[PDB]
Design an enzyme around this catalytic site. Structure first.
Site, PDB file in Angstrom:
ATOM      1  N   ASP B   7      -7.661  -7.355   3.539  1.00 49.97           N
ATOM      2  CA  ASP B   7      -6.645  -7.092   2.535  1.00 49.97           C
ATOM      3  C   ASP B   7      -5.291  -7.411   3.148  1.00 49.97           C
ATOM      4  OD1 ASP B   7      -5.876  -6.149  -0.113  1.00 49.97           O
ATOM      5  OD2 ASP B   7      -4.966  -4.428   0.904  1.00 49.97           O
ATOM      6  N   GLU B   9      -0.748  -7.053   2.411  1.00 48.75           N
ATOM      7  CA  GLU B   9       0.361  -6.494   1.653  1.00 48.75           C
ATOM      8  C   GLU B   9       1.388  -7.625   1.702  1.00 48.75           C
ATOM      9  OE1 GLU B   9      -0.184  -3.894  -0.028  1.00 48.75           O
ATOM     10  OE2 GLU B   9      -2.023  -3.538   1.110  1.00 48.75           O
ATOM     11  N   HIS B  61       3.199  -0.305  -1.198  1.00 50.36           N
ATOM     12  CA  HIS B  61       2.831  -0.147   0.208  1.00 50.36           C
ATOM     13  C   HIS B  61       3.770   0.656   1.103  1.00 50.36           C
ATOM     14  CE1 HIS B  61       5.839  -3.172   0.767  1.00 50.36           C
ATOM     15  NE2 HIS B  61       5.133  -4.105   0.153  1.00 50.36           N
ATOM     16  N   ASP B 159      -6.588  -0.216   2.876  1.00 48.89           N
ATOM     17  CA  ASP B 159      -7.296  -0.790   1.740  1.00 48.89           C
ATOM     18  C   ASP B 159      -8.539  -1.562   2.181  1.00 48.89           C
ATOM     19  OD1 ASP B 159      -5.469   0.313   0.039  1.00 48.89           O
ATOM     20  OD2 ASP B 159      -4.514  -1.557  -0.575  1.00 48.89           O
TER      21      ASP B 159
HETATM   22  C1  LIG Z   1      -0.512  -3.438  -7.309  1.00 42.89           C
HETATM   23  C2  LIG Z   1       0.641  -4.349  -7.019  1.00 42.89           C
HETATM   24  C3  LIG Z   1       0.643  -5.215  -5.995  1.00 42.89           C
HETATM   25  N1  LIG Z   1       1.713  -6.044  -5.697  1.00 42.89           N
HETATM   26  C4  LIG Z   1       1.719  -6.925  -4.504  1.00 42.89           C
HETATM   27  C5  LIG Z   1       2.365  -6.246  -3.291  1.00 42.89           C
HETATM   28  C6  LIG Z   1       1.156  -5.730  -2.532  1.00 42.89           C
HETATM   29  O1  LIG Z   1       1.486  -5.559  -1.162  1.00 42.89           O
HETATM   30  C7  LIG Z   1       0.140  -6.834  -2.778  1.00 42.89           C
HETATM   31  C8  LIG Z   1      -1.314  -6.461  -2.557  1.00 42.89           C
HETATM   32  O2  LIG Z   1      -1.737  -5.446  -3.493  1.00 42.89           O
HETATM   33  P1  LIG Z   1      -3.251  -4.838  -3.421  1.00 42.89           P
HETATM   34  O3  LIG Z   1      -3.575  -4.589  -1.956  1.00 42.89           O
HETATM   35  O4  LIG Z   1      -3.230  -3.567  -4.237  1.00 42.89           O
HETATM   36  O5  LIG Z   1      -4.148  -5.912  -4.023  1.00 42.89           O
HETATM   37  O6  LIG Z   1       0.369  -7.227  -4.148  1.00 42.89           O
HETATM   38  C9  LIG Z   1       2.848  -6.056  -6.490  1.00 42.89           C
HETATM   39  O7  LIG Z   1       3.804  -6.789  -6.293  1.00 42.89           O
HETATM   40  N2  LIG Z   1       2.822  -5.173  -7.534  1.00 42.89           N
HETATM   41  C10 LIG Z   1       1.811  -4.291  -7.866  1.00 42.89           C
HETATM   42  O8  LIG Z   1       1.957  -3.525  -8.816  1.00 42.89           O
HETATM   43 MN   LIG Z   2      -3.495  -3.387  -0.414  1.00 42.15          MN
HETATM   44 MN   LIG Z   3      -5.260  -6.299  -2.070  1.00 45.01          MN
END
Ligand SMILES: Cc1cn([C@H]2C[C@H](O)[C@@H](COP(=O)(O)O)O2)c(=O)[nH]c1=O
Ligand SMILES: [Mn+2]
Ligand SMILES: [Mn+2]
Lengths: 75, 172
Positions: B7, B9, B61, B159
């Site tokens: 995973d 961020e 995050h 995650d």
């Molecule tokens: C859930 C979410 C993720 N993201 C981006 C930043 C997170 O670090 C990245 C990975 O999300 P995830 O690990 O939940 O899949 O996606 C957004 O910009 N907005 C959101 O609402």
């Molecule tokens: Mn994540």
């Molecule tokens: Mn993710």
């Protein structure tokens, strides 16, 4: 050499997490996101609260190198 | 063979168009699994972006710009990162998101690095979950609720560990 954090000492990894929390408070203060610094220090392992306070001071200084929440960058 | 549940961020993402364009990976977390067992040979790094984290992304995050200033860049960890995942089967929830970001970052290095999909088997745990539970909610949180896994801020490594437990349950 190796950057992998997972390969480091437990203590070191613990420090990184306190840093994450400390820098997070400074971030919120910079972006004008409500935060109660004292509450966060509490949440940290007692043997690291002193570390948290120092890191909080450290990151607050770094905040000065970044735009304020009211700056164009965040418009 | 070996599996790496991974995973990442990022500084954010685009609502329209290429989701990664102009954004950056700021954390990579991955846990190794061999014979359905967590080996402990994990990978974890925070990366310095050449831009600011979107406030929204910070909402997810909690990774501050202040925290990333002293961290290495993607270029600096690239090889160590590739050495670690190469040949393994990557298990990612909504793999398209992270793979797109990974290939994006590799392309920025200008080393003609081939697409991740050519040196790693890419398994999308979200696709596996949808085939397994059609018509249901299959986000990581929904799956945790389904398998009654308790996890009382998001993190790449965090995650990844959670996805690993979920994936093992899903394929058990
Ligand atoms: C859930 C979410 C993720 N993201 C981006 C930043 C997170 O670090 C990245 C990975 O999300 P995830 O690990 O939940 O899949 O996606 C957004 O910009 N907005 C959101 O609402
Ligand atoms: Mn994540
Ligand atoms: Mn993710």
């Amino acid at each position: 050499y190796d950057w992998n954090i997972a390969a480091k000492s437990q203590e070191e990894r613990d420090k990184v997490n306190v840093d994450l929390a400390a820098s997070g408070v400074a971030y919120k203060e910079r972006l004008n996101i409500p935060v109660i610094a004292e509450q966060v220090a509490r949440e940290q392992p007692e043997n690291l609260r002193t570390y948290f306070m120092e890191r909080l001071r450290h990151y607050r200084q770094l905040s000065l190198q970044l735009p304020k929440g009211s700056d164009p960058a965040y418009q | 063979t070996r599996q790496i549940v991974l995973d990442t961020e990022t500084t954010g993402m685009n609502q329209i168009g290429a989701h990664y364009e102009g954004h950056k990976i700021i954390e990579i977390g991955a846990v190794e699994v061999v014979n359905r067992r967590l080996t402990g040979n994990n990978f974890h790094v925070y990366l310095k972006p050449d831009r600011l984290v979107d406030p929204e992304a910070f909402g997810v995050h909690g990774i501050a710009d202040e925290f990333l200033l002293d961290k290495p860049t993607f270029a600096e960890v690239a090889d160590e990162f590739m050495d670690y995942i190469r040949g393994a089967e990557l298990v990612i929830h909504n793999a398209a998101f992270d793979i797109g970001f990974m290939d994006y970052e590799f392309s920025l290095l200008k080393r003609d690095i081939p697409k991740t999909n050519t040196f790693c088997k890419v398994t999308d745990s979200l696709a596996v979950a949808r085939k397994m539970f059609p018509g249901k909610r299959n986000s990581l949180d929904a799956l945790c609720a389904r398998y009654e896994i308790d996890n009382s801020l998001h993190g790449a490594l965090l995650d990844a560990q959670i996805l690993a437990e979920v994936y093992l349950a899903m394929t058990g």
